[PDB]
Amino acid sequence: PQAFFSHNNKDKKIVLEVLEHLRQSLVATWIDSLIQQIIAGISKSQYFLAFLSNEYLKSDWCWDELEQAYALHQKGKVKIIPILLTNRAQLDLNALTDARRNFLESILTRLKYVEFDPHNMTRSLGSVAEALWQNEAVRFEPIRMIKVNGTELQVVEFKIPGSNLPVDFLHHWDLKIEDFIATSPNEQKPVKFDVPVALYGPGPNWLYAFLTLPFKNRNTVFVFNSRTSEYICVYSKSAGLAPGMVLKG
Amino acid sequence: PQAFFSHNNKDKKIVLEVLEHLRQSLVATWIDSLIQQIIAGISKSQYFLAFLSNEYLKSDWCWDELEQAYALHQKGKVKIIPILLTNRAQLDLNALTDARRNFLESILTRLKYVEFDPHNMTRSLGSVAEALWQNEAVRFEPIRMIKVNGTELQVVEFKIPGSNLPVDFLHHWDLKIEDFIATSPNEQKPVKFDVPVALYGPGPNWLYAFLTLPFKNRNTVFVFNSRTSEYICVYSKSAGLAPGMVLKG
Amino acid sequence: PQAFFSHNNKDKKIVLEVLEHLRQSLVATWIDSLIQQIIAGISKSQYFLAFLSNEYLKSDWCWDELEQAYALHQKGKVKIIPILLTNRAQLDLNALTDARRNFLESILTRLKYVEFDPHNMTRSLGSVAEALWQNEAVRFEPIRMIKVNGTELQVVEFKIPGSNLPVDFLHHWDLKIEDFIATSPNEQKPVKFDVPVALYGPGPNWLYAFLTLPFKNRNTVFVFNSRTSEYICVYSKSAGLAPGMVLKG
Amino acid sequence: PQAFFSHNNKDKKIVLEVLEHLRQSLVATWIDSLIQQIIAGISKSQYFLAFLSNEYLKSDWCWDELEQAYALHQKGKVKIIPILLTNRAQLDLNALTDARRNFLESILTRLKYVEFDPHNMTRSLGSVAEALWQNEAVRFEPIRMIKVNGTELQVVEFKIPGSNLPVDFLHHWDLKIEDFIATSPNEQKPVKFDVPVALYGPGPNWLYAFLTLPFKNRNTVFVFNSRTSEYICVYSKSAGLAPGMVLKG
Amino acid sequence: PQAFFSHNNKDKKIVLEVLEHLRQSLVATWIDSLIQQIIAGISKSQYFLAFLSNEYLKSDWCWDELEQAYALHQKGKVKIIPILLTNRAQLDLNALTDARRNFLESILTRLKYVEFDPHNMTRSLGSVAEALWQNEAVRFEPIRMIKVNGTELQVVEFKIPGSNLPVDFLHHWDLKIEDFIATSPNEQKPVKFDVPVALYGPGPNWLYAFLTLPFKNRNTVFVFNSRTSEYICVYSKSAGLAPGMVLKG
Amino acid sequence: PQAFFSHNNKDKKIVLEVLEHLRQSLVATWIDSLIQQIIAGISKSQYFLAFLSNEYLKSDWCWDELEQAYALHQKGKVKIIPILLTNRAQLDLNALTDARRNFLESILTRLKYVEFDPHNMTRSLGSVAEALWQNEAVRFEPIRMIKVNGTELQVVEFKIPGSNLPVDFLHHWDLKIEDFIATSPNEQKPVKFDVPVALYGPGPNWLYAFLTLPFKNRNTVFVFNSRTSEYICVYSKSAGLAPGMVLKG
Amino acid sequence: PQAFFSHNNKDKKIVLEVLEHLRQSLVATWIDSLIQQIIAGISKSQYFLAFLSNEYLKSDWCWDELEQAYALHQKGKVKIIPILLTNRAQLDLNALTDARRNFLESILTRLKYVEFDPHNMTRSLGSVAEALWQNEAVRFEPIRMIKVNGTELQVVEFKIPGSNLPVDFLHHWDLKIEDFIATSPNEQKPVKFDVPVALYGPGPNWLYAFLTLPFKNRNTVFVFNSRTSEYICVYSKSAGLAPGMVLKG
RNA sequence: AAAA
RNA sequence: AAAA
RNA sequence: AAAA
RNA sequence: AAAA
RNA sequence: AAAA
């Protein structure tokens, strides 16, 4: 799923680490218009991340985007997730005009908002991630760079809400993965360059085949089997790795 | 009230934000002598801001000015507010001569000093302002650049010690306000050019009359009435503003 | 507020004295058409003074002016205050036509009239003034040339019926105090030229701010503080009058 | 309570001194229409005063005013009290028409009247106040200029008929003290300007607080305590009047 | 009443809440010389707050302050209360010299101290209040905000030691309330800005009048009557409320 | 503004003295066609002074000039001010035919006329100027021969009706000073040759600069400042007249 | 004001650019004797710009010039402003003779001097102008060329120290504008030839007048009015403009 | 009239 | 065979 | 009239 | 009329 | 064959 970030200029510091955190969660991002890019791809387009803040509301340029963002939000192409950088109590509602105020208090109630606090980032980041995935198909936890039995790998863990997926789910998905693979060691990407990749999480056989398949000629692939709770190598794109060696988890 | 700033050029990096914050507090400053300018105006001349530091006391010129400043301070013409850039414990007291040392500790104990800390910026500047307003009449908080109900205005805050003021207090005041009004947008002044000016805080009616009058032909003036706790416009020097419109606060 | 005077040339001896007393009461006066001047300004345009007299009812030009005034009075844009030059008993009703008698009786009975007698100037002038402010907001009193502490002053006394005013009340006031200030000693104006002006009577802070603000560069202003019950100087334009003098009252 | 005075110009000498007497009893008095002023305020609007006299009944304009007042008085919105300038025996009933005589005879019997005699001013004035206050709430007394211990005070003495009030009495109490205070020494008001006021009469604590509160910045306030039967200064406005002095009254 | 705080900066963290709790008790607080500030106002000047701590007893600068504080306490100008941050058993009495030691034990026995602890903070806070209010007049329990019947309000609790007060008690009271009313919502003070205030507690009528009177144009005032036990509105400064409503307990 | 005079030779003795008075008011005059001179310059070209006189009604050549002037007035190019040499009652309307008697009554009733009596010469001149400046912008008063402090000075006084001017006013102001100045002492002009001039009357600074500017190398200029109310010399042209002298007018 | 320059020929590179900026601030300079030129004009002769440098102290012909300037400075004809080309710390005081050295340490201490350094042109040039007008009347900021709405324009910005000027201040003023007007584009002058000049900065009307007259037949004049904050044209010396358009800021 |  |  |  |  |  791709995402759009609308935020005020005073908050570069508090945006990218949210921006980056979503990137390691394999969520496509585009920071910098945003309105015409809404009409792109599938009906499951994207979620508007309105980084609501006191100084954000004093920018009319920021306000008009949120106006058009909600204007086509009702028609169903997008749902807006407004993250309050500050607590709802001390949002300065008096400065806005009555039309602006009534428009703000509308969406804040009938549509669920997420509060953000820089002091406790861990629960703050998770709240946005949970809000992002709340109305979604199979989840995607951030990539963990872990070490097992002396070898290094990055694990891609995905959680399936409920138990079953639609049989034709892959037709409507929008998470082609090959653009998340780093091409150079210095390049920052969710998947490190030439680092072994492991898939974790229970799921159907077609889901697993759909994920490792684009990894050919890119990275060694590891698969986790619950029968013995271990990782299994399927692709050997680097020396010292054989297809089928086992790592004890 | 005017203020004279005595300092050495090594601590230049910190003095401007001290006086810049002080200038928004409707406090006149005079950095660049200071001795002969003491004898000017009313017996409520000024306060001597001696920015005491280890390198400050190492300069013979920086010492003699304080000597004369204290010499006529005993006559009561001026009071000195000592600012310690470095905490008193690590002050290089040994480098001074015995006559120099005995003089320095004399003012330090019998006269209250203000401890300064670059890290705790907000509280430290408040303490300096507090000492300035400690022995003064009605206070003057720094100008807050606020916007309320779609219109942007600069507010003026004043706090009165006790409950009452002398009837002839305006006779002995030295705070003419036409020297704090900006003439051009680029040059800095406590009162921004053409920006609506607001008066807040309880006070006598004659105090209000003395303040709004010099703003004629300069800026739109706003007054706060506690009966409805809202703002009232008295002067309309700009388009789109009518005398008597009410701002919700 | 402005006022339109309807009178016959034999009553010219008395209208100007009424006009002057109304002028000294800070009421704008318009003597010399009047019909099209009615539709100008806001809904609180003026109050029509019908100086009813025996000869006034004998003029065809004077009759039709009243009729159109009443025609617009029904609309509520203007109202007519009938001032009786002679007593109602001795009014020449027989000479008038049947329509004129009925029209005169309709306005004299359904709308309260004012009885005027040359013998009692003080009460008659006050009743004329009282009828002007009965349905009006905060009251104005004639300017008084009063000398206190050996210093000459003029007073602008305003009385508030009900001790409460609308918050946006000034938005609907029709009076520019500048036009009442004389630009020359020979000019006839409610406020004399270079004579200090004093404000008296209870009122909100914003009313005091609005009233004395246009006085800048025109006259020195004084206000009343009921806490100590004496006048205080707030403006220094004349020689020897610093801002802050206190004059007992 | 408000009061509307209906009288003939022959009794003009007597009504104002009756009007002035009721004014000192903190009764709002309106002399100068009267019909459309009935529809204003609360159900306890006012008490119509019919100054019945031989000449008064001889005027058609005055007669129809009483007819309208009684006609809507049967609705209970207002009550009329007849004050007889002449005694009932010598009233000119024969001059009245049969409908007028029956109408006057109807009201004079079913509704209680008050007799007025010029020689007995002291008794007659008390009866007028008693009739207004026989069917009314907490009663006041006319203001007395008394001097205790060399201090001038104006006692506002009040009485409670029954020593029991509704707990929400102040909700419908249409008595605003602000309008009864003098803004100038020459102003005719029940409360004189700058003269300290004194509260007398047993009652609930909150009743006092409602009365003294508007006096802030207006007059020095005194309150009577029955524990020592002595007065207490609670406001310090005039010179030398500290809040807390004791007067043996 | 006023209070002066002398302490060491390692105890600066814990002192403020005691001061902040004390401020809520409508008790004037002065933290930051002090020795010359003792001679001010009436003989009931303040109470000295000696926060005795093991760190405190090692400061020569802090010790000598206690000397003149105790010295003029013998004259009866001020009475000192010692607050022991640590329990008396573990005070480092061995560090002090003999002369300093005999000084400290002397003031500990003949003068009542208070025992303090940070675990049982509530009782510890109450004990300090009791010591201050033991020798004082009618008490003042800290302001509490209670939402009764859907309207927010604050209660000013006052309790009278014994049963009565001197008739001239108001003269020497140093508790003018205006020093405790906030002017802005953000700035902290015992009385919140624009919040309705209520007076609850038995007392004489003049005491009630003296309290609500300074609140005009500041906050809405409520008075408690024990006859039926609700709050009675006397002042109406906020929209939606009128003087006369009742708040059932 | 321009002025075109239409009159008969019988009133030539009085026409030029009215023209001279209007010339002294800085009004441009053209005496001796006029019909084709109407279409010249700007829309606010001039005002037709129709000197209505009985003999003028007997000269058909004068009649036809009025006919087109009315016709061109109807489109708004010019406005006619009819001046009555004789009063309305004695006007010879009977000798005029039906078409002409209907012609004049339309102007006399629908358009305001000016009454002129040679006896009240001063009032007549004022009414002529008053009508001329009634529909105009800032007015120009007659220039007086005033001596102050031993200096001969010609003062130019103006008055702003309403004390407000369009900001772009100078673009459409058809008032050039250069043609009102005298080249030789014997030449008749509103401005005397080589006599120093002054500016008086409140107004914007750009208005003052515009009026004095054409005086370079022409006359010595003075200005009036209301701060001290003394004339200020700004031009050093005549001998002994330095720029900067103070003239106590 | 006037200006005399004292410098050494090695520092020719810097002085003329200091002169160039000072000339742009409308100060006439005289670089190339100087001693006899002091007795010329008024008591406010000029400010002696002593460009102190290491080599300047090494020229005997340059030194005695300073002594005569200083010696006559005691008479108050001129005040000397010393500019330090190099810092005071490494000034070659040892090379100078005892009399010469003592003369230098005299002037350097009792009169304020100016430090100048290459690396910062802007502060160095501003500080020179700052001390240039520290003891002088209304300041004249350097001429700046600003094109507004497509119209090229040069602005002369002047600011008044304090709030008021002496009424006869123009008598002693030494800023004859005609000496700063260019006659040809090629030559350099503070005012560009044929380029319109705009007047900016609050001030009295007469001061505004004093500057515009010397511009007639020379350059187009513009005046900034703060009522609406644009520039108003009063003189038309160039085609395409006639006095009166508005240049919105 | 010291929560009337 | 889209870095085999 | 000391945020009426 | 001291940026009206 | 939905971590076989």
Residue numbers in the entry:
A (entry chain p), B (entry chain Y), C (entry chain Z), D (entry chain B), E (entry chain A), F (entry chain s), ...: 2 to 33, 42 to 258
Sentences from the study reporting this entry:
Here we investigated a protein containing a CARF domain fused Toll/interleukin-1 receptor (TIR) domain, Cat1. Cat1 forms dimers that stack upon each other to generate long filaments that are maintained by bound cOA ligands, with stacked TIR domains forming the NAD+ cleavage catalytic sites. Further, Cat1 filaments assemble into unique trigonal and pentagonal networks that enhance NAD+ degradation.
The cryo-EM structure of cA4-bound Cat1 shows that the complex assembles into filamentous structures, forming intricate higher-order networks. To our surprise, we observed that the trigonal filament assembly further associates with more Cat1 filaments generating a pentameric assembly. In the cryo-EM 3D classification, we observed two distinct classes, one corresponds to the trigonal filament bundle, described previously, and the other where five trigonal filament bundles join to form a large pentameric assembly. As the filament network spreads, flexibility results in broken densities (marked as “1” in black dashed lines), preventing model building for these segments. The above-mentioned shift of the TIR domain mediates its interaction with the Cat1 dimer of the next turn and results in the generation of a closely packed spiral bundle without pitch and with a large pentagonal pore at the center. This result further supports the idea that the linear, trigonal and pentagonal filament bundles of Cat1 are not independent units, but part of the same filament network, and hence cannot be investigated on their own. In addition to the distinctive arrangement of sensor and catalytic domains, the higher-order networks formed by inter-filament association are unique to Cat1.
